[PDB]
Ligand binder design. Structure first.
Ligand SMILES: [Zn+2]
Lengths: 314, 139, 189, 61, 65, 317, 122
RNA sequence: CGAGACUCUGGCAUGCUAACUAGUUACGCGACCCCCGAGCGGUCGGCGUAACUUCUUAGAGGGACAAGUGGCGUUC
């Protein structure tokens, strides 16, 4: 019965928005990684002019920024880029604290922990690097790890033996056993290259995605596939709500919303007006971030803008 | 609490240091109104005469200049005055003030925030200059 | 507000011809404090209509051989020339400048058409940007002629041409040269 | 008397040396009688001329 | 690449009637120097990796080691 | 009042009386004339953009092959007639329609097909009297393939002439070989059998759709005379010219030089300066040395039969 | 002007042929996969190659261009070549036939066909 | 083969690597000024430690490919 509506639209960038992270501690600062090499800390404002004010322009990178993630406290940020360098931020000032060199190729995603002290990273070097918060080089986890670009690595906020998820473009979804960083569970079900993984807030489901439009959903406990969903265009981004047991998905022009009890499609999220440029491709969707408010979705577009979504119930 | 950036014309390179101050803009130790080719005095006043004195109030500005010629050093400073207040308003003031004040400058002249890359071409043999050639005679 | 030379304003300055209006500068957002700006205005075609026309009068006044790079020499000749206009007329001298430009550029010109050795010009039309370009050239050249070998100053003799053309009077050099090019054209038709 | 113009299209560049420009001309008394002209100097689309005759015919010497 | 592929050698051999002068140029190959050719290939040549054959899966079988 | 691209090609700015104006977005973007986009800039704010339904489209195409026009229409020409179908089902009584209308009722005459049936300056009085060039709910279409399908449903429409339509006088092409009529007047080869056995067929369509067609019963057209002649060897190369048998065999690219292909636009008064009072003839290029001519030029020699008395010094293409 | 070259054109088409599946419409992702496979010289060359790959992807997403021979697009093509409509145009009721065609099958013992129609001879 | 590709140069990097034969910033110390009625402020290519690379220099790596949009194109 719940719908979305294009509530508001943010303007700060020349380049495409690639990653957005929210935070439950601070419900007015939400952070945007971009391809004009900048990260805008947005002060949420929800006025008539816009839904938010661009507050800080984090500048410490030299190439495209492919990821951003905050700490459990809303004062630190960590953002990979395609310069190869992983840059730790401090949100109070806009000045780095660490600088994590140790990949050769472009770093695609950055693993952040529920413990708030684990940084072990994976790039287009196809290579997992063992570090710490300090940046302490333990070992180069490469031993039967991947064969293509490691696209996204996340952790699980689990009270059990904690589980990482490290996909690739080699159609693999892998489970490395922590306190070993040694590989146990592998998953061969997808076609085409993989692009985004989102883990359940329960601790039992991961949500793979990619080129084929079909999103495998895997039981994390037994290691068995549970739900395949269909696709429109290419999946770019996936997210999990904690309360609603849903799956949101980034289609190219649109956003396909789900319900994971009956594969129930909910709503399609798009606006285009002018039919003169109908031969021009729609601006794609790139990123997706569930806000811990329960009612707010943020997605960034290839037309270098972030558009916000609010839940109209009923 | 301090931001130091440069500006640049042909070979001149002027570096302006800004910190939380009380409205002094001195280039090379001496005031803005004192710099000698005063036929171009307003071109050095243009970052002030467009943004007003009130933006240059919690900011102290030293400018350090080398290289170039007279005119090229004048334009190298007005880059660096302007680029610094912009860069000061980024790190210490919100971004919305930075955009507001950056937009006032660029619409007056794009030169104030990005520099000309046009530098002197190499002279080649057979003539006095880069393209020119000597006279020749027939018959 | 942005005063030229800190003492001359732009909002008084009123363009008559719509033909020349988009190809003559400062009115509102072209308003700059000094003529000297040093931007790439000849980077591609039709960019030299967006530069301030006082700087156009500058860059065509350094033009001769002995003066051929000296721009601060010239923006001083300009600055002293407006204040002689103001003391002879009282008008905003930028308005006197524009009224001298408009009355100066000819409107039909001749053009040689035919084989080599045959001289039969036909009258053609004069472009608006060229009529700007022709006028400034005809204005600056008259400052050289009555002031090459006499006591009068070129910051002064510029202001005697730039007033006598805004009258459209016969005393100006840039008017007699419009009264010839556009006299010859109407014998070519 | 003295009329005006509107450059509607730039058709080509005529003349002996490639000098004059052959230009499609609208009037500014918004009459749809487009008498089409040759100018001297640079002219782009959307300019406005100033004639002393609108009686120029397509005649060859 | 004329300056690290060809090898110019110029001589002056004598005879009864005058001088002959010879020129010998040796454009070196690729496959870096086991006395043979340079390290760096031709800057025109664009070697593309041969089409690597990959196995296509149909059924989602999770090969868990 | 469905608007068509031909209404803006003739520039029928008639958004004043008919006020239910609906149109297709595609049929205005496909127009390559700039004065139509000039028409699109100001006036068409009174009309509305709309597409028809795929249920409505297929039922238009059913009697389209039954009126024998489905290959003669364009693809965008299909949707405009289906766009009239939703308007007629919306506003007008559907109870006054028909489909699968009527037979041919051949009215065989002793009139030659190439006779000037109602060509304006031709007279057998009828002058021009210089006012009549502009004297030469529904729709405004000037395409007869569009106009044929309308009146067989019994759908009175109008044109740039503000009055309604009652008479439809045009020409179609029936295959003399496979008995297949197309509404196209441009093609010279058949669409079903592919021969040059298309012949000119005049029609007359009323508002109800009384198809009665003057098949020209005259043996000057019904003639096997100039039809058999031996053909040269099939030639393959850059400059071979095979004698144009099919509508699509791959001819080599032979083109005129653009300094020869263009004529004089002698109307335009920007004209005085420079060259001779005519176009310069191309004597330099190898378009001229291979004697490449226009496909429209020399067409009267195509109509001459091959086995005839040509003069002893001619050679054509 | 700015005209591409055989080294640009003929080598970019091979990337299309072998690894179409990894390609996309970005300049900057086609370029990052270009160095993974093309053992290239200097970066200006691979930028022109990646730009022609991106332009060629744009040309493909309308329809197949002449230069390609794709193992994936031709099976897509054959599954768009197999347009099988409901009624083929060789199963029809009435086909009008000349009287001189009629006398042939009466002699070629197929005069029993009733789908024909002898028309009025023109 | 030539053309192109190439090499050098130029332009950009508040990103990386560094610097007692390059600097900047800070802190000492001194000289000097107006003073206030002490200072602070200031100028110091005046000379000493520390912070570090914006300026200087030179190494690696990125950067631009007609890429994106709109028209024109036998639409490539
Ligand atoms: Zn036929």
């Amino acid at each position: 019965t719940e719908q979305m509506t294009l509530r508001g639209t943010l303007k700060g960038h020349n380049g495409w928005v690639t990653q957005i992270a929210t935070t439950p501690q601070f419900p007015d600062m939400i952070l945007s990684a971009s391809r004009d090499k900048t990260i805008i800390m947005w002060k949420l404002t929800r006025d008539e002019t816009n839904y938010g004010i661009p507050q800080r322009a984090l500048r410490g990178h030299s190439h495209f920024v492919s990821d951003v993630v905050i700490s459990s406290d809303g004062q630190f940020a960590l953002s990979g880029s395609w310069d190869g360098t992983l840059r730790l931020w401090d949100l109070t000032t806009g000045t780095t604290t660490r600088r994590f060199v140790g990949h050769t190729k472009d770093v695609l995603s950055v693993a952040f922990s529920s413990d708030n002290r684990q940084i072990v990273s994976g790039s287009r070097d196809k290579t997992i690097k063992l570090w710490n918060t300090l940046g302490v080089c333990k070992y180069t986890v490469q031993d039967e790890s991947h064969s293509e670009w490691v696209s996204c690595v996340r952790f699980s906020p689990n009270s059990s033996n904690p589980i990482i998820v490290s996909c690739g473009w080699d159609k693999l979804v892998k489970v490395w056993n922590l306190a070993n960083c040694k590989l146990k569970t592998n998953h061969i079900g997808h076609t085409g290259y993989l692009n985004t993984v989102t883990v359940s807030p329960d601790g039992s489901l991961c949500a793979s995605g990619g080129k084929d439009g079909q999103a495998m959903l895997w039981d994390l406990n037994e290691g068995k596939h549970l739900y395949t969903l269909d696709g429109g265009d290419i999946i770019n981004a996936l997210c999990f709500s904690p309360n609603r047991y849903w799956l949101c998905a980034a289609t190219g022009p649109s956003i396909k919303i789900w319900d994971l009890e009956g594969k129930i499609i909910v709503d399609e999220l798009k606006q285009e007006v002018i039919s003169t440029s109908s031969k021009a491709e729609p601006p794609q969707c790139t990123s997706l971030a569930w806000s811990a408010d329960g009612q707010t979705l943020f997605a960034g577009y290839t037309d270098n803008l972030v558009r916000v979504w609010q839940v109209t119930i009923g | 609490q301090s931001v130091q950036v440069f500006g640049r014309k042909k070979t001149a390179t002027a570096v302006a240091h800004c910190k939380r101050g009380n409205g002094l803009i001195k280039v090379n130790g001496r005031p803005l109104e004192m710099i000698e080719p005063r036929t171009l005095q307003y071109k050095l006043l243009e970052p002030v005469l467009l943004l007003g004195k009130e933006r240059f109030a919690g900011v102290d500005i030293r400018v350090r200049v080398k290289g170039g010629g007279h005119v090229a050093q004048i334009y190298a400073i007005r880059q660096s005055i302007s680029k610094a207040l912009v860069a000061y308003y980024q790190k210490y003031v919100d971004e919305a003030s930075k955009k507001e004040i950056k937009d006032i400058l660029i619409q007056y002249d794009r030169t104030l925030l990005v520099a000309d890359p046009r530098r002197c071409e190499s002279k080649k043999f057979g003539g006095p200059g880069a393209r020119a050639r000597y006279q020749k005679s027939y018959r | 507000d942005i005063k030229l030379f800190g003492k001359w304003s732009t909002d008084d300055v009123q363009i008559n011809d719509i033909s020349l209006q988009d190809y003559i500068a400062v009115k509102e957002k072209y308003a700059k404090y000094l003529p000297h700006s040093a931007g790439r205005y000849a980077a591609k075609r039709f960019r030299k209509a967006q530069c301030p026309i006082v700087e156009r009068l500058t860059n065509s006044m350094m033009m001769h051989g002995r003066n051929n790079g000296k721009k601060l020499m010239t923006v001083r000749i300009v600055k002293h020339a407006f204040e002689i206009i103001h003391l002879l007329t009282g008008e905003n001298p930028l308005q006197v400048l524009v009224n001298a430009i408009i009355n100066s550029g000819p409107r039909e010109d001749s053009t040689r058409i035919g084989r080599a050795g045959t001289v039969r010009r036909q009258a053609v039309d004069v472009s608006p940007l060229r009529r700007v370009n022709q006028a400034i050239w005809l204005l600056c050249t008259g400052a050289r002629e009555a002031a090459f070998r006499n006591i009068k100053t070129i910051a002064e003799c510029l202001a005697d041409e730039l007033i006598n053309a805004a009258k459209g009077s016969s005393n100006s050099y840039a008017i007699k040269k419009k009264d010839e090019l556009e006299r010859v054209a109407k014998s070519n038709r | 008397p003295i009329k005006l113009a509107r450059v509607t299209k730039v058709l080509g560049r005529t003349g002996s040396q490639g000098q004059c420009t052959q230009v499609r001309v609208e009037f500014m008394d918004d009459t749809s009688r487009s008498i089409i002209r040759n100018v001297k100097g640079p002219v782009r689309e959307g300019d406005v001329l100033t004639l002393l005759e609108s009686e120029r015919e397509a005649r060859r010497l | 690449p004329v300056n690290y592929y060809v090898d110019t050698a110029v001589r002056h051999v004598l005879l009864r009637q005058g001088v002959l002068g010879i020129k010998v140029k040796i454009m070196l190959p690729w496959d870096p120097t086991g006395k043979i050719g340079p390290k760096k290939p031709l800057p025109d040549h664009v070697s593309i990796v041969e089409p690597k054959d990959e196995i296509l899966p149909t059924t989602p079988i999770s090969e868990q080691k | 009042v469905v608007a068509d691209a031909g209404a803006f090609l003739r520039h029928a700015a008639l958004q004043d009386i008919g006020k239910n104006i609906y149109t297709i977005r595609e049929v205005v973007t496909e127009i390559r004339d700039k004065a139509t986009r000039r028409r699109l800039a100001v006036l068409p704010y009174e009309l509305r953009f709309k597409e028809p339904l795929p249920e409505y489209v297929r039922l238009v195409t059913e009697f389209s092959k039954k009126t024998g026009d489905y290959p003669s229409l364009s693809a965008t020409d299909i949707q405009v007639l289906a766009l009239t179908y939703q308007l007629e089902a919306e506003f007008v009584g559907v109870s006054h329609l028909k489909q699968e209308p009527q037979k041919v009722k051949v009215s065989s005459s002793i009139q030659h097909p190439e006779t000037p049936l109602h060509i304006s300056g031709f007279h057998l009085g009828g002058w021009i009297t210089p006012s009549n060039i502009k004297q030469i709910v529904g729709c405004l279409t000037t395409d007869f393939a569009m106009q044929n399908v309308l009146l067989q449903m019994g759908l009175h429409v109008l044109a740039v002439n503000g009055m309604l339509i009652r008479e439809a006088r045009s020409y179609i092409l029936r295959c003399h070989g496979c008995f297949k009529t197309t509404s196209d007047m441009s093609r010279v080869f058949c669409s079903h059998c592919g021969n040059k056995t298309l012949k000119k067929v005049s029609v007359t369509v009323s508002d109800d759709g009384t198809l009665h067609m003057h098949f020209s019963r005259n043996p000057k057209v019904l003639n096997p005379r100039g039809l058999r002649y031996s053909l040269p060897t099939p030639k393959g190369g850059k400059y071979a010219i095979n004698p144009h048998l099919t509508e699509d065999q791959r001819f080599p690219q032979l083109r005129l030089s653009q300094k020869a292909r263009q004529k004089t636009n002698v109307f335009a008064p920007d004209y005085i300066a420079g060259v001779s009072p005519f176009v310069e003839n191309d004597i330099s290029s190898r378009s001229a040395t291979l004697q490449v001519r226009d496909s429209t030029l020399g067409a009267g020699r195509r109509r001459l039969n091959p086995n005839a008395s040509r003069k002893k010094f001619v050679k054509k293409r | 002007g700015r005209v591409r070259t055989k080294t640009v054109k003929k080598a970019a088409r091979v990337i299309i042929e072998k690894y179409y599946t990894r390609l996309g419409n970005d300049f900057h992702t086609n370029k990052r996969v270009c160095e993974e496979i093309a053992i290239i010289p200097s970066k200006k060359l691979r930028n022109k190659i990646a730009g022609y790959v991106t332009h060629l992807m744009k040309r493909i997403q309308r329809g197949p261009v002449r230069g390609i021979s794709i193992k994936l697009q031709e099976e897509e093509r054959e599954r768009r070549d197999n347009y099988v409509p409901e009624v083929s145009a060789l199963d029809q009721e009435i086909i009008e036939v000349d009287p001189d065609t009629k006398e042939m099958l009466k002699l070629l013992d197929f005069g029993s066909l009733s789908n024909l129609q002898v028309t009025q001879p023109t």
